[PDB]
Design a protein around this ligand. Structure first.
Ligand SMILES: Nc1nc2c(ncn2[C@@H]2O[C@H](COP(=O)(O)OP(=O)(O)OP(=O)(O)O)[C@@H](O)[C@H]2O)c(=O)[nH]1
Ligand SMILES: [Mg+2]
Lengths: 73, 81, 77, 98, 55, 73, 105, 74, 418, 82
């Protein structure tokens, strides 16, 4: 089953996932939207600095040159 | 394009901070489509070093962190394509 | 001759134990099983896990989408 | 790109249902925005407009960074700014406090 | 004053076709071999006679 | 791009991303800000003069340039 | 060098034609394989493919290239009518065979 | 517009690559793309620790490549 | 000193001699009157803006004797030193020796091949291989030099014979096959196969300034349309290979019965159409053709006669002669690399001696070794100038030197002078 | 194409010395160069950041990591710079 990353991000949009950035911090939230350039927009996310909770900030637009990877749960 | 917005603001005394923390107070002269900022009347305070006088400066557009604009600028007639 | 995109295609044919390196990150590496690529070499991993160099604590990641602007090496086992 | 047409209006459909539409609400509803940028600075203000490179124009902003002594956060006021888009970590709509 | 002229190429083709009776069929200077002005000056300076040439 | 056609043969200072100083005669440029500078002197900070010669500087490592002196005869 | 220009006798023939005064050429390299498929972009064309190979003025234009003076020209100055000899080539070329003695003299 | 790198002189030779964080690797070059991504056979690891680890047929993305070194004569 | 206006600075030519990799020592030769000195005239016009051909007469810039002007033939081999750019834009230093093509002056070629490394053989496309060409192939193989062949006078296939295109291709293929046969008769090297796909055979017309290989005309396509790998495109413009307009590919089998070869379809027929629209249709359809090809002319330039207008159109179209530079760099070695068979062939005492190993590297300092073959007279004739090449070391003005003659041995030491 | 790339192709065959982003200085004869700064060089003296001098006989440098190059001084009379 060929699962390219672009139908992965256009198919599993809406489920609560977590992105991780280059600096080592993690965003817990469900994906609202994503383009062909792989900019992402996720809602009501939560901030983990190295796995530790910091506070409430809101919904986040994340850019190409900031993200490290995109995993689930 | 917003960079095409930047070339409509010539002859304005703005400040520019780059990615190295260097701050430049000066009058802007030239704006390229790659945001290559050609300045004159330059007061350049490098981060943790002494401020210097410069006559003409040429900043490459990639290494720009941000601009700061004065209070007397009507942008509402300047963003119109 | 072999071009590297056909070898990534052979990797997703073989579902091998791909260990991916990272740009600027000499410590933190990721094991995974590749499924697909694109034109900009963005890579999904089936069962990914994170391995440090001084700590070496294997944590579970799942099916990740690691970007093209981060990877360095696609090695096996 | 498979769309070489001259009438290119996908970049505003990018601004409506795409990821960048977060800023267009702050163009239309004029909401407060918080920006984490690369030398550890926090910029809170109101963005006027932007583009596909996220080259933004902001007005009436307060921006903070901490200094180390031990790290204490300092703040400063700026009336108006232009911010280049590659120099950001994240752009944030501040939530409804109410 | 009727001093300079320039023509078009079909006109020159027609004027070359009509004047075919006065013009020879020569194509190169491999003709006139030992029958040109320098050989005639050499025969003048050496006081000899080319077969068909002048005396 | 006539602002860099005006800067031709001027004795100009160049600041790198590393903080080093390239002072050279402005011979040639392009759209990627690649510099051809003849008879270049390098200043670093302890101050010292380091003679280079003909320098082909890549645009990725150039930050800002300024003018120091008039062109020689 | 021998000018090998061959005159055209039939105007209905094409301007570039294998005139069989020319001797026939006797008939019989690192050619790459078709698998390494090189493909041109779609707007690539050979030069001047809309223009034909020969027109009506082609053979006449080639024939005027080997014409004597001034028929190989296309521009010049006028000459006064008593400075144009019309007999000069005739006694300049050679004597024809079978002519009498006084004509040769 | 992106022309492929002239790597025909270094095909099937033993080269050592330098990578971003002071990293080092060795192996046989087997091909490339016009984005300078490299396929390496018989890839031994050779980190800064000094111990050698063979892997096999690997792919290096070009963005972290610093330098090639031809151990074999070209 | 006073010098004519030249497109490059003379200090560049002074500083370029110090690198022995960027030099080529090339001898041009061929049969009698197959276009050697006119090609040298075209190179001089390329390198000098103020030197141009007369509208009615040949220039003959390298024919300086009065006998060479009155007879109309070449007598003495004459050198020239120029700087030429290649296709990609790199400057190179060429030392070009024009040798006379008449058979009785074959001794002027042997003195030219002693001090050179590569041979450029000019062959008339109309006459083909003749006596002196067959003798000079033998004399270039037996002296162990690299051989390249340039086919001159292709306009005689256009304006004199009026030949069909595939028949002219057959003519060029027969000439190249005859060259390959004369190479394979005398050479023991099986790697001396000449073919235009290898960049080894160049095509030219000296009277109208035409010079192209496959790579230069592919570079013309890449400069006209863009996004074309011209070095890969030039690998398939010779032989029985066909452009299929359906799949846009180069296939060895026939798409149709009327499908022309790729060399006819892409290269030779546009040349026919340029010459046809200049010669036959100068009055009606020439501005449309010049507007399609991208060449603009002045109204005063449009009133010229047919031959200078055709030379001007071909010069504005093809431009600089880069294919000849590419051929003479690719298939002729540098004097640093090609020094070893020269020392093995020409130096008495073998290459295995101490001085042969020193001359085998072309060392610009050390033992000064020079070999002079040619003697030129002055305007007065009271004294002569020696002419040769510098094998090793650097020769200086005012330096005392030791001249060694042909009767010198180490046992005798009689034929020597300071 | 621009002006400095023609100067880079002009300096082929000569001894250039290049410094890259890792602070390493490579001096030797430039064999090949392209439109981008991919430089194939030979007979290389290698200076590290600490100061070790090495002799590496074939080096191929990616153009992305290059800080700058240092070219020979006789290129001021080159035709494209005049
Ligand atoms: N048709 C035509 N004639 C040419 C061409 N090149 C040269 N010729 C003519 O042929 C004649 C001889 O040319 P040269 O260059 O003098 O011949 P050459 O090879 O120097 O003779 P050598 O003195 O033996 O070297 C002259 O009339 C030239 O104009 C060409 O491309 N086409
Ligand atoms: Mg001659």
């Amino acid at each position: 089953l060929p699962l390219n990353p672009k139908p992965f991000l256009n198919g599993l949009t809406g489920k609560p996932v977590m992105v991780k950035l280059k600096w080592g911090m993690e965003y817990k939230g469900y994906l609202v939207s994503v383009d062909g350039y792989m900019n992402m927009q996720l809602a009501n996310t939560e901030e983990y600095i190295d796995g530790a909770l910091s506070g409430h900030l809101g919904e986040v637009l994340i850019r190409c040159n900031n993200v490290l990877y995109i995993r689930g749960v | 394009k917003l960079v095409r917005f930047l070339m409509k603001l010539s002859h304005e005394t703005v400040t520019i901070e780059l990615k190295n923390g260097t701050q430049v107070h000066g009058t802007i002269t030239g704006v390229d489509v790659s945001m290559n900022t050609h300045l004159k009347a330059v007061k350049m305070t490098l981060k943790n070093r002494e401020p210097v006088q410069l006559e003409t400066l040429s900043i490459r557009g990639n290494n720009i962190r941000y601009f700061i604009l004065p209070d007397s600028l009507p942008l509402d007639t300047l963003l119109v394509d | 001759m072999v071009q590297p995109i056909n070898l990534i295609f052979r990797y997703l044919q073989n579902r091998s134990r791909i260990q991916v390196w990272l740009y600027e990150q000499v410590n933190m590496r990721i094991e995974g099983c590749i499924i697909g690529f694109d034109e900009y070499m963005n890579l999904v991993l089936d069962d990914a896990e994170e391995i440090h160099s001084k700590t070496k604590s294997r944590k579970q990641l799942g099916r990740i989408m690691l970007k093209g602007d981060n990877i360095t090496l696609l090695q096996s086992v | 790109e498979m769309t070489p047409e001259e009438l290119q209006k996908r970049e505003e459909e990018e601004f409506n249902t795409g990821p960048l539409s977060v800023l267009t609400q702050s163009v239309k509803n004029n909401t407060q925005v918080l920006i984490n940028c690369r030398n550890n600075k926090k910029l809170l203000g109101r963005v006027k407009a932007f583009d596909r490179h996220c080259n933004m124009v902001l007005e009436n902003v307060k921006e903070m960074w901490t200094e180390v002594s031990k790290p204490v956060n300092k703040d400063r006021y700026i009336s108006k700014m232009f911010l280049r888009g590659d120099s950001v970590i994240v752009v944030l709509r501040n939530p409804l406090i109410a | 004053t009727y001093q300079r002229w320039q023509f078009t190429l079909p006109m020159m083709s027609t004027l070359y076709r009509l004047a075919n009776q006065l013009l020879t069929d020569l194509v190169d200077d491999n003709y006139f071999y030992l029958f040109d002005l320098k050989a005639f000056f050499t025969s003048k300076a050496l006081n000899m006679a080319i077969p068909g040439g002048p005396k | 791009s006539s602002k860099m056609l005006q800067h031709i043969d001027y004795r100009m200072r160049c600041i790198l991303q590393d903080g080093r100083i390239f002072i050279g005669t402005f011979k040639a440029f392009d759209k990627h800000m690649n510099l051809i500078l003849c008879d270049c002197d390098e200043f670093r900070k302890r101050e010292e003069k380091r003679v280079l010669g003909l320098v082909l500087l890549r645009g990725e490592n150039l930050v800002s340039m300024t003018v120091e002196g008039p062109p020689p005869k | 060098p021998n000018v090998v220009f061959i005159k055209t006798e039939d105007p209905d023939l094409p301007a570039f034609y294998f005139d069989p005064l020319i001797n026939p050429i006797s008939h019989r390299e690192p050619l790459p394989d078709d698998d390494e498929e090189f493909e041109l972009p779609e707007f690539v064309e050979p030069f001047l493919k809309d223009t034909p190979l020969y027109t009506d003025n082609t053979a006449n234009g080639i024939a005027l290239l080997w014409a004597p003076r001034p028929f190989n020209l296309r521009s010049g100055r006028t000459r006064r009518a008593l400075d144009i000899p019309l007999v000069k080539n005739w006694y300049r070329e050679h004597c024809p065979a079978g002519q009498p003695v006084k004509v040769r003299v | 517009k992106a022309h492929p790198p002239e790597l025909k002189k270094f095909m099937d030779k033993k080269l050592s690559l330098k990578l971003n964080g002071g990293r080092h690797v060795q192996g046989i070059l087997r091909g490339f793309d016009p984005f300078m991504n490299l396929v390496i056979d018989e890839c031994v690891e050779m980190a800064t620790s000094g111990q050698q680890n063979n892997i096999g047929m690997v792919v290096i993305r070009g963005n972290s490549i610093i330098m090639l070194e031809a151990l074999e004569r070209v | 000193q006073t010098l004519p206006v030249t497109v490059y600075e003379m200090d560049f030519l002074a500083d370029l001699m110090d690198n022995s990799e960027l030099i080529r020592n090339v001898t041009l030769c061929g049969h009698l009157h197959h276009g050697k000195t006119c090609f040298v005239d075209c190179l001089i016009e390329q390198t000098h803006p103020e030197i141009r051909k007369r509208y009615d007469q040949d220039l003959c810039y390298t024919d300086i004797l009065f006998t060479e002007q009155e007879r109309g033939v070449g007598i003495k081999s004459t050198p020239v030193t120029v700087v030429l750019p290649d296709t990609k834009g790199k400057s190179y230093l060429f030392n070009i020796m024009d040798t006379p093509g008449h058979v009785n002056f074959s001794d002027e070629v042997t003195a030219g091949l002693r001090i050179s490394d590569g041979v450029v053989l000019f062959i008339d496309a109309a006459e083909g291989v003749m006596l002196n060409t067959e003798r000079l192939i033998k004399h270039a193989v037996q002296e162990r030099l690299a051989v390249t062949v340039c086919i001159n006078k292709i306009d005689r296939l256009i304006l004199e014979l009026k030949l069909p295109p595939t028949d002219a291709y057959y003519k060029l293929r027969h000439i190249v096959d005859e060259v390959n046969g004369l190479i394979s008769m005398y050479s023991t090297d099986e790697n001396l196969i000449l073919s235009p796909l290898l960049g080894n055979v160049c095509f030219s017309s000296s009277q109208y300034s035409i010079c192209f290989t496959l790579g230069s005309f592919a570079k013309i396509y890449a400069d006209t349309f863009g996004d074309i790998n011209y070095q890969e495109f030039a690998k398939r413009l010779w032989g029985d290979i066909y452009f299929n307009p359906k799949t846009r590919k180069f296939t060895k089998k026939a798409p149709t019965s009327s499908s022309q070869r790729s060399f006819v379809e892409f290269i030779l027929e546009p040349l026919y159409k340029i010459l046809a629209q200049v010669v036959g249709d100068v009055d009606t359809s020439l501005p449309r053709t010049l507007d399609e090809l991208g060449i603009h002319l002045t109204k005063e330039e449009l009133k010229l006669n047919i031959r200078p207008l055709l030379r001007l159109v071909c010069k504005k179209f093809f431009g600089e002669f880069t294919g000849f530079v590419d051929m003479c760099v690719q298939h002729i070695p540098s004097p640093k690399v090609g020094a070893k068979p020269k020392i093995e062939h020409t130096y008495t005492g073998g290459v295995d001696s101490d001085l042969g190993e020193a001359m085998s590297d072309c060392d610009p300092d050390g033992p000064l070794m020079c070999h002079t073959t040619k003697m030129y007279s002055t305007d007065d004739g009271v004294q002569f100038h020696a002419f040769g090449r510098v094998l090793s070391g650097t020769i200086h003005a005012g330096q005392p030197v030791k001249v060694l003659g042909e009767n010198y041995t180490l046992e005798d030491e009689e034929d020597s002078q300071i | 194409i621009g002006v400095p790339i023609k100067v880079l192709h002009e300096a082929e065959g000569h001894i250039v010395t290049c410094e890259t982003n890792t602070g390493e200085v490579y001096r030797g004869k430039l064999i090949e160069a392209e439109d981008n700064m991919n430089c194939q060089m030979s007979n290389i003296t290698v200076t590290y950041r600490d100061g070790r001098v090495a002799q590496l006989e074939q080096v191929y440098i990616r153009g992305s990591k290059i800080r700058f190059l240092i070219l020979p001084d006789m290129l001021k009379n080159a035709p494209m710079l005049k």
